[PDB]
């Protein structure tokens, strides 16, 4: 008798409990130390390398541990793996599906992930002695588009989905060992912590959910956003993460604090963020917006350190190396501007 | 060392560049066609009559030596606000709309809202929409026998008349054509709200017979690329 | 309506799991943030200007 309404009321009461518990630990803010840390300034970043070989719009990219090779997929069914040092297309895999939305370079530099509206993840191997590259594994267990995916190691890879079910696939068996159910809107992106024990996922429900890959449950949730979280990026320290959404506000959340730290918003920005990535130190934040320009923001001063020229179309994908050597921004103009 | 392995890498990069410049011709010559609908709107009958030839996601064909690419989305979820942003390089968004599915639910208004969102989209603003008023045979008997009437979900239909560009056919009632053109102009009323010139709508009436519907798509994409190049050269 | 009941049950279970967690102060969170920044500031190639010789892209 009256179970649905009482359950909704209990959920609202628990949400208010989470809210005022976050407020109880919100006795300060990150802006209270603005007089201690010095800013960076208007640092002019120039395009060092430009990978002008893509045909369709570069939708997703991901760097490697060696900070040398970078993957990038386009809607023409192509996925090119470039050597950013010499601007050379080391690999070019013609994907079985034209429209693809995700990219993931394995930390070992052997496996490469793709996928899109085809509901499948195509894992390819690069170090094969057979010569040319072929489809090493096909993952077909999702009922929604694969927005993003990230490799934990050469064995398992965690992929987002369009049906609110992130799946931790295993390349050995090709079957979902766990499932990260609990999201309300389709997951748009996800990122992995340096320790790889836990990973965060930003969805369109304006609530980034941080799960663990060992037990498969929902560790933390962050509902401080206002629109679809188009991209997410874990802090290099592993205790925080930035979220870029469509509301033109990049929100920095913390795992232990379970709340937001800063909102890198601006009145001169009406378009939403498409990609977010931290630097090596995490002080800098590369945010690819929808205004055809990528903004370097400060994670402490809460202001845009600078804006980058170049792309004339929407910058969709963004990737900073593991050592923070050179950030690569790939827009919808088949261009990959490798900044520095 | 410095060039012992970098030379082979440069040769491989040159081979990849040759492959990509060879694929560029067949890619740019290929005009993709995004096909979607509000639900059971007859898109199956559209993709079935395509060149007379892991589920059913994408089907390809070629007419007049022009290979197209029709991607069906009859398996993704109802939320289209994210993956449709991938269709900004597509040449046309074939909107297969069932003009008779308004009885079962008011799916016609949902299709109208979907078309409005596709039109006012920041990324689909430069992409034309091939409007396909599917299920025309099931609409004539509906508007004639009184089983399904437009005025239940549209008040403007009482204040609307058939324009001077009507296309009568043998065995058709003037009221059927009036309702069809009213739905067409209601779809066209959103096409002129923005009027940015970068994209235009193209209404069509299919599913009445099982004839070659690919001609109505080929001759449509022809004018699509025509007006695209005209707006690009400012001769429009 | 059973599907909505199950969804609400999963939601309230997730909320209960979120309730009994150890939340540190946001001041210590910002302190850890700035500590990691100042520890990796002089080593970040993006933060400080990297010379052309030591940079493999110039």
């Amino acid at each position, epitope marked *: 008798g009256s179970e649905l309404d009482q359950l909704r009321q209990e959920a609202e009461q628990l949400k208010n409990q989470i*809210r005022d518990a976050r407020k109880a630990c919100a006795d300060a803010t990150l802006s209270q130390i603005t007089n201690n840390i010095d800013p960076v300034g208007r640092i002019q970043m120039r395009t060092r390398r430009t990978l002008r070989g893509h045909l369709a719009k570069i939708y997703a990219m991901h760097w490697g541990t060696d900070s040398r090779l970078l993957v990038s997929a386009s809607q023409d069914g192509k996925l090119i793996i470039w050597d950013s040092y010499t601007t050379n297309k080391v690999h070019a895999i013609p994907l079985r599906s034209s429209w693809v939305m995700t990219c993931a370079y394995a930390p070992s530099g052997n496996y490469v992930a793709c996928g899109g509206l085809d509901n499948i993840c195509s894992i390819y191997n690069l170090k094969t002695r057979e010569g040319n590259v072929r489809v090493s594994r096909e993952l077909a267990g999702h009922t929604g588009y694969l927005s993003c995916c990230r490799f934990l190691d050469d064995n398992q890879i965690v992929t987002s989905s369009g049906d609110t079910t992130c799946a931790l696939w295993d390349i050995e068996t090709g079957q979902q060992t766990t499932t990260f159910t609990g999201h309300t809107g389709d997951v748009m992106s996800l990122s992995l912590a340096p320790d790889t024990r836990l990973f965060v996922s930003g969805a369109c429900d*304006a609530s980034a959910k941080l799960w663990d890959v060992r037990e498969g449950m929902c560790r933390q949730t962050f509902t401080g956003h206002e629109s679809d979280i188009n991209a997410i990026c874990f802090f290099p320290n592993g205790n925080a993460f930035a979220t870029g959404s469509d509301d033109a506000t990049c929100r920095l959340f913390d795992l232990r604090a379970d709340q937001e730290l800063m909102t890198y918003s601006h009145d001169n920005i009406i378009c939403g963020i498409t990609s977010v990535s931290f630097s090596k130190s995490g002080r800098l934040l590369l945010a690819g917006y929808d205004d055809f320009n990528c903004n370097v923001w400060d994670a402490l001063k809460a202001d845009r350190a600078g804006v980058l020229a170049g792309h004339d179309n929407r910058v969709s994908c963004l990737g900073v190396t593991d050592d923070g050597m050179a950030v690569a921004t790939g827009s919808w103009d088949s261009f990959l501007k490798i900044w520095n | 060392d410095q060039r012992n392995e970098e030379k082979a890498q440069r040769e491989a990069n040159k081979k990849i560049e040759k492959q990509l410049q060879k694929d560029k011709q067949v890619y740019r010559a290929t005009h993709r066609l995004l096909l979607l609908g509000a639900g059971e709107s007859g898109k199956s009958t559209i993709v079935k009559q395509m060149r007379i030839l892991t589920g059913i996601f994408e089907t390809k064909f070629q007419v007049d030596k022009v290979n197209f690419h029709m991607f069906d989305v009859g398996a993704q979820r109802d939320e289209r606000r994210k993956w449709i942003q991938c269709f900004n390089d597509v040449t046309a968004i074939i909107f297969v709309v069932a003009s008779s599915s308004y009885n079962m*639910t008011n799916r016609l*208004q949902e299709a109208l809202n979907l078309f409005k969102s596709i039109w*006012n989209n920041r990324w689909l603003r430069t992409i034309s929409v091939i409007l396909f008023l599917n299920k025309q045979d099931l609409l004539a008997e509906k508007v004639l026998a009184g089983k399904s009437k437009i005025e239940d*979900y549209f008040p403007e239909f009482a204040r609307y008349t058939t324009p001077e560009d009507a296309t009568p056919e043998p065995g058709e009632d003037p009221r059927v054509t009036r309702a069809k053109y009213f739905i067409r102009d209601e779809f066209l009323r959103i096409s002129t709200a*923005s009027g940015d010139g970068r994209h235009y709508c193209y209404p069509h009436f299919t599913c009445s017979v099982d004839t070659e519907n690919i001609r109505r798509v080929f001759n449509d994409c022809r004018d699509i690329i025509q007006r695209m190049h005209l707006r690009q050269y400012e001769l429009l | 309506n059973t599907a909505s009941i199950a969804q609400a049950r999963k939601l309230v279970e997730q909320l209960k799991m979120e309730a009994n967690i150890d939340r540190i102060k946001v001041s210590k969170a910002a302190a850890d943030l700035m500590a990691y920044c100042e520890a990796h500031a002089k080593e970040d190639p993006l933060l400080t200007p990297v010379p052309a010789s030591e940079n493999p892209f110039r």
Partner: nanobody
Amino acid sequence: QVQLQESGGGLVQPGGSLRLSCAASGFTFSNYKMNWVRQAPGKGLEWVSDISQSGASISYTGSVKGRFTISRDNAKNTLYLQMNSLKPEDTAVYYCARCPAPFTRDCFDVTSTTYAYRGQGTQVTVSS
């Protein structure tokens, strides 16, 4: 938390008047295209009406065009929807949803249940 509480609703006589007040907290209400969508018991959701970021491009569905009235107030972050001349078909669960994209005119909130920004809705019941 993006929360939308729609106060109002209840038993309605056919042809009367009703007012729902949707208070949306957790975001900048003066920047999105809020919209009311109804769902009839046994049928899918039906888009009712939407309003611009300021209130310029107001549009309704063909079933309520001329009867309903949607108005946004930014000083209180509220959305007021007035139903006039109720009909036995207008009885449904109403949801005050928000489409995520700001500074825009497109919205994809006509989908089915389990939406990102959509309240529990009010069961507007038309009596006899």
